[PDB]
Design a protein around this ligand. Structure first.
Ligand code: NAG
Lengths: 50, 24
């Protein structure tokens, strides 16, 4: 039967710890602008400020 | 044999920086 057939399963386990992250998709890193009210993204952390 | 532990045995519970604060 269909349920009794063998199945290859991979479980992906990931951590939301605040350590320096290493594993993530291709995202271009723009230049750094200081002393100005800009939107920013740092390791998936989104915000708006100076 | 046994001895007093005093105030030893305190570690950082997380790697998040906090400054000038009393944290539980
Ligand atoms: C701790 O150990 C010392 C020496 O073994 C003993 O005098 C003392 O009563 C002990 N204190 C406690 C709370 O077990």
């Amino acid at each position: 039967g269909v349920g009794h057939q063998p199945y290859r399963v991979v479980v992906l386990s990931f951590e939301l710890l605040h350590a320096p992250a290493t594993v993530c998709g291709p995202k271009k890193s723009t230049n750094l602008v200081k002393n100005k009210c800009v939107n920013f993204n740092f390791n998936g952390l989104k915000g708006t400020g100076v | 044999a046994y001895t007093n532990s005093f105030t030893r045995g305190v570690y950082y519970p997380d790697k998040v920086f906090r400054s000038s604060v009393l944290h539980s």
